[PDB]
Enzyme design. Structure first.
Site: not given
Lengths: 49, 518, 518, 49, 120, 527, 206, 49
Positions: C386, C85-86
């Site tokens: 995650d 996501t980063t």
């Protein structure tokens, strides 16, 4: 030297440690060189104040 | 002397026209960017809704969400809303064409011809244009080959204005298959459009069968083969009562206890009546109490609860079952049959898969993609595509687009302008120029040299090359039949007629009058 | 040549690009093995710590719409991958930056989008080429993937113990054969304050946050579990009812008889042999009566109130016990059995339920999360979730890539040479694309405190014959063969990142203007 | 300044003169800056550090 | 670019967090050890509460800065687990944070410090 | 411990941005300035129109004026404004693009910072690149030192520099005007010229083409007495500063008349002195007179009585222009006035230039005059001012050419070759300064891009073709066909520019942006 | 990011053109009524000056007394002032022609041709037009008969736009005699214009 | 508004609604008049219609 190296974006801990080690015995005028990013005899490098 | 209350206005025949036309032209040039195969699209953002925003290309939505104060602009917005209600796209076209009509009519007002004559001339020219358009139509009846070919052509055409353009072939196959599944039914509700994040937009697809976004009951069998399906509206968790509201007054709690018991047996024997149909799949729009589903699991029959009227309709269409109640005469109710029922998970959620369906009446497209805005606009685009494509099925005639048809209209109007002689002829030429302005704007947003392109196209049409149109991947004139850049007759017909009516009503105005807002 | 009249579209494009780039750089700090988390204070007064980008952006109340599309992007990536996501948002930022460059570089955005499509096609081909197929059965590679994803958030603190946690949980929940996309919601997460993150524990069983209701029973051995839905209280019908009192024996007949009714209930419950009771919410009406609790405690039955309806499916999956909703169906056939069940005591007096050991092994599993700070616990559960997501991703595609930006520099090199081979302005586009991918290693070096440009350049030079195995290493502070440092992430992660980013950038390029609404 | 006149500086003493300090103890440091500026030059920076 | 509030990064926020931690430390620095001197709180309306046990002080003291809330919650947990050391644990946390920052305040990469702390 | 304390007063409102965030903000601001300026470059460029605080208007293309009239508040905007002012009043046009260079350079600099390069090395590399650029530039310089009497290399140069201003309508004519003026007033033995000797003067009315240089001086006064003849053929000129009044020693002084005869003697003296001065001016042999100050009406008449037209209330600078144009002197008394000091000219004639407004005075002196004036006419006050500024810049550039007689063909070819040389050096660069080199080259590449953009062509197809040609051939004489002529040989197109122009431009921009990179921290007091 | 002080604007290439052209067209259609032998005339009233007001037909005065904020309009106003300084009427004509020029140029911008090309083409066309006009001139030198005839013609023409139109012949004789009295001197100050109430306008005389 | 060559009016409702019409009764009905005899004419038209 720490502020110098920080404004130079170096690991001033490596620089400081090498500085102290070399500067215990090897010569008086060793210090930070910005472009070479490590110690040098700045006196011969003509950094004279 | 003051006549109205404070906060009321009176603009007569100069400022009224000026404000109306400024509003109309502002609306037009506000949306011109969205039209054309190389067109652009807008961002609309809520005032405060946690910034509810919709990247959008379809002009109808754009006018829907914009708040406009100038009355004429609001009239145009409602116009676009109606046109979208009819065909889906061309809202773009309708608004822009009306806007240029009004601008050029303002130019005529500068020439100082009475507006009534303008109206009459425009009515005449509109009649001529619609007649010429009707002369240019092409039918496709039993010719299934050419038919389906032109159908996918229509899909490719209308689709190539939203973001899905770079996947024109894919969604073309999608829409073609979807509408062909309708067997001529115009009820788009038979097509469900489920949208959920994840995966590329290319990953969006049509299942072979049907999908449901509901939760299974407690551990009834998860997967079912050769499933028999039954559908009803009889509520369970709302325990079946007798709506008037009788009391229960009893001397001893023995009686209330046995009444509880009788409630349970009544529910149970309704369940047994259900099961007597020998049906392993059962659904209802109402919520179902868990005791009934416990009985169902005792029978091992899978049951899905609380699928709304839309879902019930879609299941009935896809599976052929007759949504029911009281189950009293099993022979008189036709059940639903499907090859297989299973649970699949997409992205994050387990969904109810209906493969191997008896009836292809209904269907549902999976929408995979990137953004709730991207997914939302894709949803809107597919809905518009399905609308126009169903309209195509109802009326099996087509028109060659790419501005070509509209330029035929303009050419015929100009020809009639000579037989006019009178002031009306000026408005005739006016109408022709306004019409021609559309493909001009198209090639404009396409970054090509509009001026030469439009002139060359008019030269070809005045010569008689009724097929020659516009290429949007090289910016030149070409044979539309080769490229299949076509659209439904009804679309452009509504465009013209509505635009003419809008021009009539707007020009007929010569005074705006606002009461003080409350 | 053709003239561009308007400039509002270009300016608004530029504004959007600047906003996106600013957001990207804001996220830029939190990334990679050297990642630094942020904290957000809610206007409500809530406080959160986070290193994962998706939570950061969801906590963002972003004003400018472009970044809201970015937030949505991150949401989609997380609902697909879990980290990156980063990575994906930072790629978005770099892409739009090169898009700026190309805008004053005068090329029309549509060509940019098409060239980008070619670029992503080349990239996906390369990425598929470079991976290493890996069977799901090899635990150690799974473990490496875990610890790869983990040592980027705060929980790297106890990474060494958390990684086996996650991998074992997933192995117990999957089917190791079908290679399906086993759901994460089958994994139960428990936020229990207090304790130490080290003391996080797996429970191969069932855990309920609720508390007991029996005073005297705390631990039960060889317990047989049964879950019951119908209330245990005075019988109250679905429809309105009331006892009427008019006579003499009515009083004691009532009292004695609700006692007798509750007695029959509890007596049958015991006759089934159960010793642990589960009762769901019945907020609509009476819950378990106190008198029935008295009987049960008298008969020494473990009892629990207030079971959430959403938990019932999870519970029955886990302990393998279908519920019972009427007296008769409650039978020793359905009473589930578990090796042990009791109430642990942590938090000094914050008490919790554990049921360890079940003869009917449910595929589900739960996680107990410990730690001092509430915020650190929430971050830890995010990171563990995650980890499960990334393992699931690996299940989706049995392909593995060494992490540490090496795939990205590989991409940059191959795409640059591809652009050199391919002519046209699309060549310039693709060169921009590769320079955009160049960013991730630069960020890695920056957060690693190393000379970024020198490191990136030398790493490309190495990689010219130093294929993806080599890359940027944190621990040694230089460039080495990352695979032998055992830092690997699944193909799906970066693939989804690239695909989503490319579609979003194309969509952004389609945008030209924003219209304020009502 | 509040008057809108820009002023860039690398010599620290000039900067400290511009940063009108209110806190008392720091006024001593800024005064040292003036002293070194009047005496020997750069390193007024270094003096403060 | 977020409405309704600014943001602070890097050295500023690091120093701010250390500053808050030192503040909280000095709040209780005088109540530990066999010569500790107890605290007391004029509440707002006269219902005072003399106490030297740190966790009680922290709970009855309203706090707004985040890290200080973190320390307060830590003190509460410690009380839930031991009973004293709220005399001490807050001080320990603040002092460790102070010196760790002092390392970081130079350049030193935080995660290295974290690993060193774990080993410690 | 924890408590707020005052360090700097107004501590709440003393904002501060530091480090990379500050840098990126600064680059954004500079880029905004660059975008505002971009459209003003090139003959195809478009100019700006400013609104004065007092509601006045001004249309212009000169970037120096653009930034001067701007009311900026962000500091670095002020720095760019001062940049343009300095560059202009050193050189002239070029400010048409100097800040453009600044902005593009800073943009690409930000591109580098994004990769975490420390700014100082960026500055050092940019300095090295600038030195390389200027030395390659003056290697590839042409020269006009070897030129014959420089008539229309100067004419070509003016033709070029005026391709940017709206006065381009008859810009041929104004080119001859500029070159003739400067050549007349140049001090070749010194290599300078003082523009004070140049009298810029624009009077609204008439066509633009009517604008004409006058080898003489034009004075905003009519004749002292309306009855005097309008034309004079001879130009025996007298230049006086003592007003035609009874002398008064400005020490606080006043007489003490007492008697009948005292007053009678004073009364006699009153007219006797006027007769004396009239006789003096007549016997001097002069024909026309000019006075610094006002007249006594009585002497006004008596002067009329002797066929000696004169002008009243002439401001200083105009007076000395008269003196130098006529070769006369400035005489402080009548008595010391003699024929030798008298000024001479060819023709002096009042002009009723305005159809309904008061008049003007022109001196068509015919011998050599170290001074000259330009008379500008046209239909707009704004166009008048624009012509003033444009012609002033043209004079500046020709002056600069006088300072250095070597120029470079314009049209962007120069800096194109500069960029290519920079790229060539970038291969022998070694480390990180290499990125600085290629960085500066790409940033410098902007001017051709902007020219083409204002040309409406696809910028980059054109510039790539330009690079390809200037590589395959060795001619650094290929720019951008701004005016759509099938030859990129601007040497044949004559699009030329002073070496000093570009050299000063690029060096100044390098230093400016070097400082812009040199800054990190800002403390703005809240307004 | 904010650059100017508060109260400063930045309109670039769409709104700038739009505002300028709206102002120009507004100025034009504001004065179109005053032109033509059957033209109309305006009333201008002071804000507060005891209501100092001037019924007016000459456009130059109209633009002089009107306060305009749009810069382009102010440019046009100064244009008219200069033209009046040169010839007196046609200020009407100059402003209206410029206004239609701008409107039609806006129409061209809608056609999206680069403005620079517009400027070049207009320059060429203006050159051609001025040349053709010069080719159409008619001199009258020593031909005193035809001269004076054409002179009174000029008077009758230009006069027939102000209120004096219904006395064209009279004031024609007036102006003819007056200017012929000048013996070629262009100093209009040699003509005094005394005005005092009473009597018909026909009673005005030399 | 009279005559086939006539031109109709468009009204703005208090609630922001619009209406285009030629029927004078509607014209006056939607009007928000305040002067009384205007109301009398409005009622006139309503009655006649």
């Amino acid at each position: 030297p720490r502020q110098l190296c920080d404004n130079a974006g170096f690991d001033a801990t490596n620089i400081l440690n090498k500085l102290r080690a070399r500067h215990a015995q090897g010569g008086t005028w060793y210090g930070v060189d910005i472009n070479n990013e490590d110690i040098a005899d700045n006196f011969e490098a003509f950094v004279w104040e | 002397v003051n006549i109205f209350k404070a906060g009321a206005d009176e603009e007569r025949a100069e400022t009224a026209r000026l404000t109306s036309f400024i509003g109309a032209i502002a609306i037009g040039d506000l949306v011109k960017s969205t039209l054309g195969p190389k067109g652009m699209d807008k961002i609309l953002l809520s005032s405060g809704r946690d910034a509810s925003l919709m990247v959008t290309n379809d002009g109808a939505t754009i006018l829907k969400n914009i708040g406009v104060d100038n009355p004429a602009a609001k009239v145009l917005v409602d116009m676009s809303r109606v046109q979208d209600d009819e065909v889906g796209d061309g809202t773009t076209s309708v608004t822009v064409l009306a806007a240029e009509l009004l601008r050029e009519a303002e130019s005529l007002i500068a020439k100082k011809i009475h507006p009534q004559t303008i109206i009459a001339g425009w009515r005449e020219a509109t009649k001529a244009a619609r007649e010429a358009l009707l002369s240019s139509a092409v039918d496709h009846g039993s010719d299934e080959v050419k038919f389906r070919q032109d159908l996918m052509n229509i899909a490719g055409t209308t689709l190539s204005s939203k973001l899905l353009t770079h996947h024109k072939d894919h969604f073309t196959k999608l829409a073609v298959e979807a509408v062909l599944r309708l067997k001529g039914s115009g009820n788009l509700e038979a097509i469900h459009i489920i949208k959920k994040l994840g995966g590329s937009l290319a990953d969006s697809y049509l299942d072979e069968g049907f999908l449901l976004d509901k939760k299974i009951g407690v551990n009834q069998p998860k997967r079912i083969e050769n499933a028999k399906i039954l559908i009803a509206n009889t509520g369970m968790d709302t325990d079946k009562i007798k709506i008037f509201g009788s009391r229960v007054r009893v001397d001893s709690t023995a009686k209330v206890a046995e009444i509880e018991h009788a409630e349970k047996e009544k529910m149970k024997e309704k369940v047994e009546r259900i099961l007597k149909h020998g049906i392993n799949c059962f659904i209802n729009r109402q919520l179902i109490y868990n005791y009934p589903e416990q009985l169902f699991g005792a029978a091992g029959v899978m049951a899905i609860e609380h699928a709304d009227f839309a879902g019930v309709e879609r299941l009935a269409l896809v599976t052929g079952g007759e949504i029911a109640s009281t189950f009293d005469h099993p022979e008189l109710v036709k059940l639903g049959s499907c090859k297989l029922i299973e649970e699949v998970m997409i992205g994050e959620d387990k969904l109810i898969h209906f493969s191997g369906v008896a009836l292809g009446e209904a269907c549902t497209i999976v929408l995979r993609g990137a953004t709730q805005q991207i997914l939302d606009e894709a949803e809107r685009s597919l809905h518009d595509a399905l609308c126009v494509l169903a309209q195509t099925v109802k009326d099996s005639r087509t028109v060659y687009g790419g501005g070509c048809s509209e330029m035929l209209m303009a050419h015929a109007v100009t020809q009639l302008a000579n037989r006019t002689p009178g002031k009306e002829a000026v408005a005739m030429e006016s109408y022709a120029k306004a019409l021609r302005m559309l493909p001009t704007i198209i090639a404009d947003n396409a970054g090509y040299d509009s001026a030469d392109l439009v002139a060359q196209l008019r030269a070809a049409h005045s010569e008689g090359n009724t097929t020659a149109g516009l290429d949007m991947r090289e910016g030149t004139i070409g044979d539309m039949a080769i490229l299949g850049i076509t659209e439904s007759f009804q679309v452009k017909r509504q465009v013209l007629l509505s635009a003419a009516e809008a021009a009539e009503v707007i020009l007929r105005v010569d005074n705006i009058i606002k009461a003080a807002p409350r | 040549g053709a003239y561009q009249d308007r400039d509002k579209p270009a300016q608004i494009r530029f504004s959007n690009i600047s906003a996106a780039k600013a957001v990207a750089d804001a996220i830029r700090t939190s990334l990679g093995p050297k990642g630094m988390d942020k904290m957000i204070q809610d206007g409500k007064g809530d406080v959160t710590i986070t290193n994962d980008g998706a939570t950061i952006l969801k906590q963002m109340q972003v004003l400018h719409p472009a970044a809201r599309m970015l937030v949505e992007l991150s949401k989609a990536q997380d609902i697909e991958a879990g980290d990156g996501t980063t990575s994906v948002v930072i790629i978005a930022g770099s892409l739009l930056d090169s898009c700026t460059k190309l805008l004053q570089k005068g090329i029309h955005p549509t060509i940019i989008s098409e060239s980008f499509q070619k670029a992503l096609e080349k990239g996906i081909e390369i990425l598929t080429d470079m991976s290493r197929p890996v069977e799901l059965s090899d635990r150690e590679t799974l473990l490496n993937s875990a610890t790869t994803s983990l040592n980027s958030k705060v929980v790297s603190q106890y990474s060494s113990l958390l990684s086996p946690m996650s991998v074992n949980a997933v192995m117990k929940v999957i089917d190791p054969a079908t290679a399906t996309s086993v759901d994460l919601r089958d994994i139960k997460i428990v936020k229990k304050l207090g304790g130490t993150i080290d003391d996080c524990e797996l429970v191969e069983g069932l855990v309920l946050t609720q508390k007991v209701s029996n005073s005297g029973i705390t631990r039960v051995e060889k317990a047989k579990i049964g879950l019951i839905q119908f209330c245990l209280s005075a019988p109250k019908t679905d429809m309105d009812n009331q006892i009427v009192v008019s006579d003499y024996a009515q009083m004691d007949r009532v009292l004695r008889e609700e006692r007798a009714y509750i007695l029959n209930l509890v007596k049958q419950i015991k006759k089934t042999g159960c010793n642990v009771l589960l009762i769901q919410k019945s907020i609509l009406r009476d819950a378990l009566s106190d008198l029935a609790l008295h009987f049960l405690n008298k008969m020494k039955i473990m009892v629990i109130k207030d079971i959430e309806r959403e938990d019932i499916e999870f519970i029955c999956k886990t302990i393998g016990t279908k519920p019972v909703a009427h007296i008769d169906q409650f039978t020793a056939d359905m009473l589930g059995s578990a090796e042990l069940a009791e109430e642990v005591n942590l938090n000094g007096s914050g008490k919790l339920l554990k049921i360890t050991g079940c003869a009917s092994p449910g595929k589900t599993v739960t996680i107990v999360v410990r730690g001092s700070n509430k915020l650190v616990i929430e971050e830890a559960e995010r990171s563990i979730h995650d980890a499960l997501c990334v393992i699931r991703c690996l299940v989706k595609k049995r392909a593995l890539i060494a992490g540490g930006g090496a795939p990205e520099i590989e991409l940059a090199l191959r795409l640059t040479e591809y652009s050199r081979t391919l002519s046209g302005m699309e060549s310039y586009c693709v060169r921009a694309f590769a320079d955009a991918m160049e960013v991730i290693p630069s960020t890695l070096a920056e957060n690693a405190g190393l000379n970024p440009i020198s490191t990136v350049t030398e790493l490309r030079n190495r990689h010219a014959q130093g294929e993806k195995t080599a890359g940027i290493n944190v621990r040694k502070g230089g460039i080495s063969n990352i695979l032998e440092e055992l830092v690997v992430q699944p193909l799906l992660v970066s693939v989804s990142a690239l695909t989503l980013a490319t579609e979003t950038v194309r969509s952004i390029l389609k945008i030209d203007d924003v219209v304020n609404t009502r | 300044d509040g008057r809108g006149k820009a002023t860039i500086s690398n010599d620290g003493a000039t900067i400290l003169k511009l940063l009108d300090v209110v806190h008392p103890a720091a006024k001593t440091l800024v005064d040292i800056a003036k002293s070194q500026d009047a005496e020997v030059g750069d390193g007024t920076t270094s003096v403060t550090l | 670019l977020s409405v309704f509030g600014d943001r602070s990064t890097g050295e500023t926020i690091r120093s701010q967090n250390v500053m808050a931690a030192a503040s909280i430390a000095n709040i209780v620095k005088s109540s530990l050890g066999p010569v500790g001197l107890d605290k007391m709180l004029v509440d707002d309306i006269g219902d005072v509460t003399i106490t030297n046990d740190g966790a009680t002080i922290l709970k009855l003291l309203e706090v707004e800065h985040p890290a200080a809330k973190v320390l307060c919650e830590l003190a509460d947990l410690q009380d839930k687990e031991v009973g004293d050391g709220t005399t001490s644990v807050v001080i320990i946390a603040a002092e460790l944070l102070k010196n760790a920052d002092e390392l970081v305040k130079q350049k030193i990469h935080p995660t290295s410090v974290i690993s060193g702390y774990r080993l410690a | 411990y924890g408590r707020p304390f005052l360090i700097i007063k107004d501590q709440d409102r003393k904002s501060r941005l530091m480090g990379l965030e500050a840098l990126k903000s600064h680059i954004m601001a500079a880029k905004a300035v660059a975008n505002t300026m971009r459209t003003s470059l090139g003959p195809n460029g478009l100019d700006k129109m400013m609104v004065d605080k007092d509601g006045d208007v001004t249309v212009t293309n000169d970037g120096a004026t653009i930034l001067s009239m701007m009311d900026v508040d962000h500091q670095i905007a002020k720095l760019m404004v001062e940049l343009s002012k300095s560059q202009d009043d050193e050189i002239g046009d070029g400010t048409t693009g100097v800040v453009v260079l600044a902005g593009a350079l800073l943009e690409e600099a930000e591109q580098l910072l994004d990769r975490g390069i420390h700014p100082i090395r960026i500055a050092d590399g940019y300095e090295q690149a600038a030195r390389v650029a200027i030395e390659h530039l003056d290697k590839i310089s042409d020269s006009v030192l070897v030129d014959i009497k420089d008539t229309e290399p100067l004419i070509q140069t003016a033709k070029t520099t005026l391709g940017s201003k709206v006065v381009n309508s008859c810009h041929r004519q104004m080119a001859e005007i500029a070159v003739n003026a400067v050549l007349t007033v140049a001090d070749m033995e010194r290599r300078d010229v003082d523009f004070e000797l140049i009298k810029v003067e624009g009077k609204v009315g008439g066509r633009l083409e009517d604008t004409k240089l006058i080898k003489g001086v034009i004075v905003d006064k009519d004749f002292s007495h309306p009855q005097m003849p309008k034309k004079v053929e001879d130009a025996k000129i007298a230049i006086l500063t003592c007003p035609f009044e009874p002398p008064k020693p400005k020490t606080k002084h006043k007489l003490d008349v007492t008697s009948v005869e005292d007053y009678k003697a004073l009364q006699k003296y009153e007219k006797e002195k006027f007769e004396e001065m009239i006789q003096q001016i007549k016997e001097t042999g002069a024909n026309l007179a000019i006075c610094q100050w006002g007249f006594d009406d009585e002497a006004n008449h008596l002067l009329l009585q002797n066929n000696l037209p004169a002008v009243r209330w002439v401001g200083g600078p105009e007076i000395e222009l008269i003196a130098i144009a006529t070769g006369g002197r400035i005489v402080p008394r009548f008595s010391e006035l003699t024929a030798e000091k008298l000024g001479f000219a060819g023709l002096v004639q009042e002009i009723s230039f305005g159809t309904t407004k008061d008049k003007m005075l022109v001196i068509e002196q015919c011998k050599n005059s170290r001074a000259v004036t330009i008379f500008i006419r046209g239909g707009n006050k704004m166009i008048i001012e624009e012509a003033k500024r444009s012609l002033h810049d043209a004079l500046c550039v020709i002056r600069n050419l006088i300072r250095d007689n070597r120029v470079v063909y314009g049209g962007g070819a120069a800096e194109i070759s500069c960029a290519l040389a920079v790229s060539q050096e970038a291969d022998k660069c070694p480390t990180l300064e290499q990125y600085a080199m290629r960085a500066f080259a790409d940033a410098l590449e902007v001017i051709p891009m902007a020219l083409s953009e204002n040309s409406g062509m696809n910028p980059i197809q054109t510039m790539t073709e330009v690079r390809a040609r200037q590589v395959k051939e060795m001619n650094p004489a290929l720019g951008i066909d701004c005016l759509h002529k099938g030859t990129n040989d601007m040497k044949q197109q004559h699009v030329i520019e002073t070496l000093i122009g570009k050299k000063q431009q690029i060096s100044l921009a390098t230093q400016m942006v070097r400082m812009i990179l040199k800054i990190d921290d800002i403390r703005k007091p809240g307004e």
